[PDB]
Paper text:
Because the structure of the LNS2SS2− domain of [name] was known, the structure of the [name]‐LNS2SS2− complex was determined by molecular replacement with the [name] LNS2SS2− domain as the search model, resulting in a well‐resolved electron density map for the unknown structure of [name]—roughly half of the amino acid content of the structure of the complex. This electron density map was of sufficient quality to build an atomic model of [name] by automated methods. Visual inspection of the [name]‐LNS2SS2− structure revealed multiple key interface residues. Among these residues, I401 of LNS2SS2− interacts with a particularly deep hydrophobic binding pocket in [name] (formed primarily by Y249 and L251). Of these mutants, I401Q had the greatest effect on [name] binding to LNS2SS2−, nearly eliminating the interaction. While glycosylation of [name] may stabilize its binding to neurexin (Reissner et al, 2014), we were unable to produce well‐behaved [name] without glycans on its own and thus could not assess the effects of glycosylation on [name]‐neurexin interactions. The I401Q mutation in [name] LNS2SS2− greatly decreased binding of [name] to [name]–3 LNS2SS2−. The primary sequence conservation of the interface residues suggests that the [name]‐LNS2SS2− binding interface is maintained in all vertebrates.
Neurexins are presynaptic, cell‐adhesion molecules that specify the functional properties of synapses via interactions with trans‐synaptic ligands. Neurexophilins are a family of secreted, neuropeptide‐like glycoproteins originally discovered as α‐neurexin ligands and later found to bind to the [name] domain of α‐neurexins (Petrenko et al, 1996; Missler et al, 1998; in the following we often refer to α‐neurexins simply as neurexins or Nrxns). Here, we determined high‐resolution structures of the complex of neurexophilin‐1 and the second laminin/neurexin/sex‐hormone‐binding globulin domain ([name]) of neurexin‐1 and examined how alternative splicing at splice site #2 (SS2) regulates the complex.
Numbering used by the authors:
A (entry chain B): 118 to 180, 191 to 212, 217 to 263
B (entry chain A): 280 to 378, 394 to 487
Write the structure that this text describes.
Amino acid sequence: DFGWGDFHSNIKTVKLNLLITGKIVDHGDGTFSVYFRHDSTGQGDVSVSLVPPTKIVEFDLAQSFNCRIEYEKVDKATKNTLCNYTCYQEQTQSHVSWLCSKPFKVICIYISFYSTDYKLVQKVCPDYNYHS
Amino acid sequence: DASIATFKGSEYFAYDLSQNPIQSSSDEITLSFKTLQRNGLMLHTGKSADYVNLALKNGAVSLVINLGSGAFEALVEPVNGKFNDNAWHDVKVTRNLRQVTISVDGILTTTGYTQEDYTMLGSDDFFYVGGSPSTADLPGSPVSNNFMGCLKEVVYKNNDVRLELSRLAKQGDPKMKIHGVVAFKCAALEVLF
């Protein structure tokens, strides 16, 4: 089977809050899906993706490996109201389905979070120590 | 009062963990740092498959953890500035069987997954603060040079013991060894001649 399931992450500043959940599903045909849902409220940009363990953890302005996105749904609501004049609030709900071909199972989760006060990138490799 | 130490790049603490192994289902690390340097190792614990590495990397806080079967790496930074701004910053890292948490000033991340495994949070090898031996590159250390700046109230805590490493170094402990000489204060970093 797999070394993990029911992945969860929360990244929080006063300017942006991000909640992520992740789920694996083995289809029994040599493939498996990774489903991510995430919700964010505030100001800034967030992303979650699958990456190989060789991905360098680094900040980046932009946006062999046998996983690919098959479906993505993103819903984003923006409320504009001036603070003292401008000022806005973004509510985002995303669902992403990744489809992976099983021969290789060492996948990592890569999360980026760029708010107006702080930025953070993180890479989680749940069964990496089955790599070596 | 607070236990502080200034590192100048050739100094580190080393708490002997050989004759007292450490095991726990959860642990916690807290510290405050002040610095002007972009890169430097603040704390490393663990020469086993398990370890925690906390460093400044290009002015960001870098955390690398190997928590049993999995690995975690994070980089944290203010948006319009860096953490090597000659101001204190507070770091807290929490691990248990299901979850890792790191917070740096006003940002906090909690990340976990269902592991379904029996694992031990421990380290046989020395607990390093402020640096490490030059011919000893530590597991998961993204930086290769010792800290230059101030560390304050470095505390390692688990369910068995709590080690006030900054205090032990300031006061003395036969397991607490200091390489080089460090002032147990925070010197004016703008002048580190």
